[PDB]
Amino acid sequence: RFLPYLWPADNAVLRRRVVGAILMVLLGKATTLALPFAYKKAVDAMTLGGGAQPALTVALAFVLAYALGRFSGVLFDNLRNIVFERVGQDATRHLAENVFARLHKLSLRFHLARRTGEVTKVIERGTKSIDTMLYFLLFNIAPTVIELTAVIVIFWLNFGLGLVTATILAVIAYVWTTRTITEWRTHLREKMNRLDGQALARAVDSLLNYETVKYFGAESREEARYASAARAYADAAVKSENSLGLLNIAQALIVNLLMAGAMAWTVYGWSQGKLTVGDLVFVNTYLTQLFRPLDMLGMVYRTIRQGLIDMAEMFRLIDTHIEVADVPNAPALVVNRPSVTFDNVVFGYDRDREILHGLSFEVAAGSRVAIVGPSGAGKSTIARLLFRFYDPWEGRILIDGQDIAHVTQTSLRAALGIVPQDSVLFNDTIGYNIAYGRDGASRAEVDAAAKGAAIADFIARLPQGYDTEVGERGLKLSGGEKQRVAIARTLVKNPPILLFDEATSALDTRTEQDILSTMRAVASHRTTISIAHRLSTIADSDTILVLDQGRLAEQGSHLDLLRRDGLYAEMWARQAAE
Amino acid sequence: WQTLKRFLPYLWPADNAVLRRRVVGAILMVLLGKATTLALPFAYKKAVDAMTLGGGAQPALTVALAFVLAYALGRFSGVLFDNLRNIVFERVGQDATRHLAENVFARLHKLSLRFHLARRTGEVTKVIERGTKSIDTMLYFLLFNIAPTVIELTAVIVIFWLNFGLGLVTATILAVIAYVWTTRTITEWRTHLREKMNRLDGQALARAVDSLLNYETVKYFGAESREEARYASAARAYADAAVKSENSLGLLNIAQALIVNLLMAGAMAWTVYGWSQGKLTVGDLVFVNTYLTQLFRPLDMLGMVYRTIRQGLIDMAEMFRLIDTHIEVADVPNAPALVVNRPSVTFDNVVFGYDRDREILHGLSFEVAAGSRVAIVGPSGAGKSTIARLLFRFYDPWEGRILIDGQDIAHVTQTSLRAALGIVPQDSVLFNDTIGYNIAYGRDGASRAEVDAAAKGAAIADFIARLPQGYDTEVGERGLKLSGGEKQRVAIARTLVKNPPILLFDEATSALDTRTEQDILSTMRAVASHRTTISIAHRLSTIADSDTILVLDQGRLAEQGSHLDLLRRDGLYAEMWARQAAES
Ligand SMILES: Nc1ncnc2c1ncn2[C@@H]1O[C@H](COP(=O)(O)OP(=O)(O)NP(=O)(O)O)[C@@H](O)[C@H]1O
Ligand SMILES: Nc1ncnc2c1ncn2[C@@H]1O[C@H](COP(=O)(O)OP(=O)(O)NP(=O)(O)O)[C@@H](O)[C@H]1O
Ligand SMILES: [Mg+2]
Ligand SMILES: [Mg+2]
C-alpha cells in the first residue's frame, strides 16, 4: 500500500485525460450492447417483414446499425488508447524514476553484495507488473463488471430466469476453474522467475569478468554454467505454458457448454412457439460478447496475482536495506576546524568478525596525517566509517568535535573528499569525469584540477583531449591515469577534509611527488589523511598512524618512528632494504 | 535478405531430432483447427433449417442437433487444437530460445577485448534481450503464421466463390489489398520512431546500469539527484517516442476497422438484397457474418507480424554485423599449438598502438630469457600493461612480432598460447562467489590440495583460516568485500592454481605490505625452478632482486640490467630509485 504517490496527479489536467478515456470505454461498451439488438433486424427479414417495407428496414437499419456499431466500438477503444497513452507513459516513467532513486537510496552493504543481472531483471519485471496492474485496475475492472451485469440483465428481461441461472453458473465455474489453475501455476511461475533472474545474474557476472575468463581460458566453463540455469528455466517455462494451455481449454469447454445450452433452449423455445430464430443470433452474439470479457478477466486475475508477488519481490529488494539514517531534526555539520577524531570506535562488518577493536586517534585540523598497517588492519574500514557508509558498534567519530552520526549525511559527505582504493569512472569522457567533482564545474576548475592531478599534460597530448572516452570503469586509461582522474575529481570538489585511500599506488614516485607538492603549495588549511603501503609516499607526513590488530599501535613523524625502533621502523627497514 | 540465407545453416542441425514429429504434429493441429473454423459457419447456416423447412418436429431435430454438434463442438475443437499445438510445440520453442541464448552468450564472449573495454553493460543487456526475443518471434511467425493465414484466406475466397458468385470475392480481395496497403504504409510511417525508441531505451538502461556501477562514486560526490535527472531525461525522451508510436498504432487499428466494416456492410447488404430477390437465405447472412469475422481476425495480427518480421530481420543483420566487425584477433588457417620447451619471451621490433592516431610502442625489442625473473619498470603511461596485453594477444602489433620459445604468437592458436601464460592483471576482478570458488577457478576441476597449496603460496591461507565461513566467505561483486591486498592475493592464488610456465604480474602486489609481498615472492622462488616471471611495479623494492630490469619510457626501452648495474650507471632507474628512497 503506497497510495499517496499517485495523488499529485490531479494537479495536472490528467482528470480531463482519464475521464474522457473512461467515457470512451463506456461509449464503446454501449455500442457493444446495441450490436445484437442491431442484429435482430433479421427478425424483420423473416418474421412479420417490415412496417414500411420488408427489405428496406432490414437492409438500411441493419447496415447502419451493425457496421457503425462494430466500427464505433473499435474506434472508441482506440480513442481511449490514444488519449490515455501520454498519461500511461508518464506514469511508467515516474515509477521507473522513483525505483531508480530508491535504488540509489540503499545501503553500501546491499550494493557490495548485490548481483547486477538479478537486480536488473527484478526491477524490470516488477515495474512491468505494477504498470499492468494499475492499467487493469483502471480499464479492466469496472467496464468488465458493467458488461457482465448488463448482459445478465438483458437475458433476465428478454429470456426469463433460465438463461441468467445458466449464465451465472457458467461464470462461477469459470472463475473457480481460473482460480484453481492459477493457484496451481503460481508455484511454477515463481520458480521460473527465480531461475530466470539467476541465469541473467550469472550472465552479467560473466560479462564483468570477461578479462578473467580470457586469462584462464574458461569460456566453455562459463557457457556450461549459464546453460545449466537456461535449461532449468526452459523446463519451468514448459510446465508453466502447458498449465496456461490447460486453463485455456477448460475455459473454452465451460463457455461452449454454456453456448450449446443457451442456443438449445432458445431454439426449443422457437420450436415450442415461444421464441424466434432472431433470438438465436441474439443469444449467439451476446454470448460471444460475454466470452470476450471473461477471457479478459481470467488474464486480469492472473496478472494481478503475479503482479502482486513480483511487486512484493521488488519491494523486498528495495525495502530493508537502509542502515545509516539521519536522526530526527539533524543539524548540519559546521566545519570551522577540519579535525577528525576516532573515539574508541569498535566496528565490524558482520557481528561474527570484529575488525576495529576500540580505535582512537586525533587528526589535527590542517595537518597531513598518514595511516599505515598490514593488509587487513582496517584502514579502508576507517575510510568507510568516516564517510558513514556504516555506523560503528561502539565509540564515535567526530569532525570538528561533532558526532557524524548526529548530523545530516549530506553535510557530512560535503565536507569529505575520498579517492577510493577501487577507483571507478563513468563510461564517459575524461572531461565529464573530472567535472563530476562539482555540479556545474567550469572549464577553469577542470583545468586547474587536471594540472594539480598531473594529467593536464597527458590530456593535452591526447588526440581527442578532454573528449577521450575512458570506457566502462575507466579501463581504457592506464592505472595511474585513472587514479589521477579520481584525484582531479576530488580536487574539483575541493572539500575541507581529503582522504586518499591508496590514491597514488599506480603512479611512479615522480608524478606522485608532483601531485603532492602541488597540493601542499596551493592548499592552506586542508586536512589530508592518506593510506599507502608504499612508505615513501607518506614519509613527509606530519604524523603517521600505525594500525595493528584493529587498534592504534604507534604515532609520530617518520624520524621519530624510525628512532623509536617500533613497528613503523620495521616496515621502513624492510621496504628500504637494498 | 541474404542474412536469413546465411543464418539458415544453424537451424539445419535442429532438423536432426524428434522435433520433426513435434513440428509436424503442431502444423497438423493448426490445419485441423482451421478446417473446423471453416466448417463452423457452414453448419451455423442451419438457421435456414430453423425457419425454412420449419414449424414441426423434424426441423427442431435438424436444428438442435446441427448447431449443438457443429457450432459449439467446432469452436471448442478449434480452441482445443490451437492450445494442443501450443502444448506440443512448447518444448521445441523453449529449446530453440535456450540454444539461441547460449549461442549469443558464446559469441559475446568471442568478441575482442576492445569491444568489452568500450562496451556499455546495460545497453548490451537490453539489446541482447530484445534481439533474441525478436529473432525467436520471427521464427515462430514464419513457421506458424504464414501458411495457416494463406490457407484460411484462399479457402474463404473459394467458399465465397462457390456460394456467392464472383462479386463478393472481388470485393473481398479489394478489401484485403487495401488492408495490407494501409498496414504497410502506417508501419513504415512508424518504423523510424520505433528504431529511435529502442535506441533511447537502450541508452537509458545503459545510463542507469553505469550509475549502479558507480554507486560509491555518486555517494562520494553527492550527485544522486544528478544521476536521477540524467536518467529521467532519456526516460522521458523514450516516453515521447513511445507515445507517438502507440498513437500511430491506434490510427492503424481504426483504419483497419474502417476497411473491415465497410466490407462487412457491403457484403451483408448484398446478401440481404439477394434474399429479397429470392436468391439467398438468411443463413447466407449469418454465413457471411461469421466468415468475415473469422477472416479478419487473423489479419488483425498480421499487421504486427510484418513489423515483427521486419525488426527481427534487421536485428539479425545487426548481429551478423557485430560479429563480422568486433573480432580483430583470429587464428591463422591450420594454426599449430604452442610448444613451450624453454619459456623464453622475445619482443622483435614491436610497433603497436591501440588506435592509429596515437602510437604507444615505438619499435620495442627485448629478450626475456627462459627461467629468468625479469622486471619492467617505468613512469605511468610508458606502456608496460600494453606489453602485458600484447603478450596475451589481446591485440596484434602493427609492426614487429612476439615470440615464445621462438614461435610467433600470431601464428599459433590462441588457446595454446594463453594456456602457457598466467597473468595477475593490474585490475583484478573476482566472481561474485566465495573465496574458494575464485581460487579454484585457476584450473578446471582443481583439488582442495591444490587450492590450499596456492592459498599458502599467496600468503592468504591464514586469513581464510581465521574467517568464520572460511573458503565459503562471499566476496561480493568484483570481490569488493575483500580488501585490496586480499583480492590481489586471491588473483595470485588463481594464477598459481593454473601453474603455467610463464607468469606475468602486472602490479600484482601493489596493495600488499612489503612483508606479505616478500613472503609470496620468496615462496615462489623456492617452489619455482624454471618458471619465467615478468613483473611490473612502481614500488621498486618489489623488483630490486630481479635478474634483469627493463626500463620503459614513452614506449621505448631506455635502460636494461641488474639493480646494481642500473644504479651504477646513474641513469633513469638510478633517478627513480633515489627519488623513491625519500628518507623524508
Ligand atoms: N563488506 C565487507 N564484508 C565483510 N568483510 C569485509 C568487508 N569490507 C571489508 N572486510 C574485511 O575487513 C578487513 C579490513 O578490510 P580493509 O579495511 O579494507 O583493510 P585494509 O588493510 O585497509 N585494505 P588493504 O590494504 O588492501 O589490506 C578485511 O579482512 C576485509 O576482508
Ligand atoms: N584501449 C585503449 N585505447 C586507447 N588508449 C589506450 C588503451 N589502452 C591503453 N591506452 C593508453 O596507452 C597508454 C599506456 O597504457 P598502459 O599499457 O596501461 O601503460 P602503463 O605503463 O601500464 N601505465 P601505468 O600502469 O598507470 O603505470 C596510456 O596513455 C593509456 O591511456
Ligand atoms: Mg584498503
Ligand atoms: Mg598498467
From Swiss-Prot, chain A:
This is ATM1-type heavy metal exporter. Belongs to the ABC transporter superfamily. ABCB family. Heavy Metal importer (TC 3.A.1.210) subfamily. Mediates the ATP-dependent export of glutathione-conjugated substrates, such as heavy metal-glutathione conjugates. ATP hydrolysis is stimulated by glutathione binding. Protects cells against toxic heavy metal ions, such as silver and mercury ions. May also mediate the transport of glutathione-conjugated aromatic hydrocarbons, such as dinitrobenzene. It is a multi-pass membrane protein. SMART domains: AAA. CDD domains: ABC_6TM_ATM1_ABCB7. Its main location: membrane. The keyword Transmembrane helix applies. It comes from the Bacteria. Signal peptide: none annotated. SUPFAM superfamilies: ABC transporter transmembrane region, P-loop containing nucleoside triphosphate hydrolases. Residues 40-61, 158, 265-279 are periplasmic. The chain crosses the membrane at residues 18-39, 62-84, 134-157, 159-181, 246-264, 280-301. GO terms for biological process: monoatomic ion transport; response to mercury ion. Keywords: ATP-binding, Cell inner membrane, Cell membrane, Ion transport, Membrane, Mercuric resistance, Nucleotide-binding, Translocase, Transmembrane, Transmembrane helix, Transport. Gene3D superfamilies: ABC transporter type 1, transmembrane domain, P-loop containing nucleotide triphosphate hydrolases. PANTHER family: ATP-BINDING CASSETTE SUB-FAMILY B, ATP-BINDING CASSETTE SUB-FAMILY B MEMBER 6. ATP binds at Y349, G373, P374, S375, G376, A377, G378, K379, S380, T381, I382, A383, R384. Residues 85-133, 182-245, 302-578 are cytoplasmic. Changing Q251A: Abolishes glutathione-dependent ATP hydrolysis. It is found in: Cell inner membrane. The keyword Secreted does not apply. GO terms for cellular component: plasma membrane. Its EC number is 7.-.-.-. Homodimer. Residues 18-306 form the ABC transmembrane type-1 domain.
